[PDB]
């Protein structure tokens, strides 16, 4: 019953910015915090960051610090992710994810490929 | 209209049997 | 609830068992085998607690 | 930071026999604060085992995971034709959780 549909794939030039959305339904968006994971084609998964959906407190990754920004719209039950100054190797399938009935991994999104 | 309820509504307060005793 | 924090802040599941005694006939008790009853002698009995 | 290494990149085994996978850590990780992942081709990753011993909902008993501290092992008893996919190991004991690189099973 829980379904998460993300925004379409993006093709962009190096140095520019990209924003990816993911709509949520079938659960209380505020109750479960959102998580973002990156996976380059052929490489593994790397966690990107956390932002709670209740108060909005922040915990970013050191590697990606100063370039990533997540915001959430509680009224539309939709999560966003802003990423500026992209480079070539950051071309990857980007997932949004909330843990449900599990510590982690639940509800990985259909993925969004940003091609830089 | 109103009436006066006389000596009514008494029930067993504790479901423990007692006999030949006055219990408050 | 953070799984990356100090241990005294991680969630714990607590179940509180509150017992109401004498309130009604006894119905929830452990596995104890019963015996036959012996009359006209002082015996150390246990009837529903 | 805690780095992960899986010794077999690909294992070439006929369906029916015994397969073993390794994934160790560099700094000690609590056993409870662990999970294991199976990512099908073209599908989102799926949690096979969490807590390093406990299966999730809908996981066949042929799978099982074990290990504690730094060294961890995934067990597959019977290889079915649909099982041939890629498997990820992940620990979240302290701060940033680190994922695995993957292991492919070949017929």
UniProtKB/Swiss-Prot annotation, chain C:
Lineage, opening ranks: Viruses, Riboviria, Orthornavirae, Pisuviricota, Pisoniviricetes
Interval of the full protein contained in this chain: 497 to 545 of 1273
Subunit structure: Binds to host ACE2. RBD also interacts with the N-linked glycan on 'Asn-90' of ACE2. Cleavage of S generates a polybasic C-terminal sequence on S1 that binds to host Neuropilin-1 (NRP1) and Neuropilin-2 (NRP2) receptors. Interacts with host integrin alpha-5/beta-1 (ITGA5:ITGB1) and with ACE2 in complex with integrin alpha-5/beta-1 (ITGA5:ITGB1). May interact via cytoplasmic c-terminus with M protein. May interact (via N-terminus) with host bilirubin and biliverdin, thereby preventing antibody binding to the SARS-CoV-2 spike NTD via an allosteric mechanism.
UniProt-reported outcome of changing residue 5 to T: Reduced host ACE2-binding affinity in vitro
Function: Attaches the virion to the cell membrane by interacting with host receptor, initiating the infection. The major receptor is host ACE2. When S2/S2' has been cleaved, binding to the receptor triggers direct fusion at the cell membrane. When S2/S2' has not been cleaved, binding to the receptor results in internalization of the virus by endocytosis using host TFRC and GRM2 and leading to fusion of the virion membrane with the host endosomal membrane. Alternatively, may use NRP1/NRP2 and integrin as entry receptors.
The protein's name in its UniProt record: Spike protein S1
Phenotypic consequence of residue 23 to P: Increased resistance to human covalescent sera neutralization
Top-level taxon: Viruses
Stated consequence of mutating residue 9 to H: In strain: Omicron/BA.1, Omicron/BA.2, Omicron/BA.2.12.1, Omicron/BA.2.75, Omicron/BA.4, Omicron/BA.5, Omicron/BQ.1.1, Omicron/XBB.1.5, Omicron/EG.5.1
């Amino acid at each position: 019953q829980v379904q998460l549909v993300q925004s379409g794939a993006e093709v962009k030039k190096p140095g520019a910015s990209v924003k990816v959305s993911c709509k949520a339904s079938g659960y209380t968006f505020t109750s479960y915090a959102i998580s973002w994971v990156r996976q380059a084609p052929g490489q593994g998964l790397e966690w990107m960051g956390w932002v709670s959906a209740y108060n909005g407190n922040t915990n970013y990754a050191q590697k990606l610090q100063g370039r990533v920004t997540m915001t959430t719209d509680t009224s539309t039950n939709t999560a966003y992710m802003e990423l500026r100054s992209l480079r070539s190797d950051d071309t990857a399938i980007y997932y949004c994810a909330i843990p449900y009935s599990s510590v982690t991994f639940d509800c990985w999104g259909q993925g969004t490929l940003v091609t830089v | 209209a109103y009436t006066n309820s006389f000596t009514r509504g008494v029930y067993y307060p504790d479901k423990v049997f007692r006999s030949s005793v006055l219990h408050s | 609830f953070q799984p990356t924090n100090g241990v005294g802040y991680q969630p714990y599941r607590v179940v509180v068992l509150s017992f109401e005694l004498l309130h009604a006939p006894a119905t929830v008790c452990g596995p104890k085998k019963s015996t036959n009853l012996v009359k006209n002698k002082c015996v150390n009995f246990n009837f529903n607690g | 930071e805690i780095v992960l290494t899986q010794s077999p990149g690909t294992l070439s085994l006929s369906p029916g026999e015994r397969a073993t996978l390794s994934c160790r850590a560099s700094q000690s990780v609590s056993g409870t604060f662990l999970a294991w992942y199976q990512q099908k081709p073209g599908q989102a990753p799926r949690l096979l085992i969490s807590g390093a011993s406990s299966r999730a909902t809908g996981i066949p008993d042929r799978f099982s995971g074990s290990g504690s501290g730094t060294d961890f092992t995934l067990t597959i008893s019977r290889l079915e034709p649909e099982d041939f996919a890629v498997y990820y190991c992940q620990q979240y004991g302290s701060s940033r959780p680190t994922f695995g690189q993957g292991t492919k099973l070949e017929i």
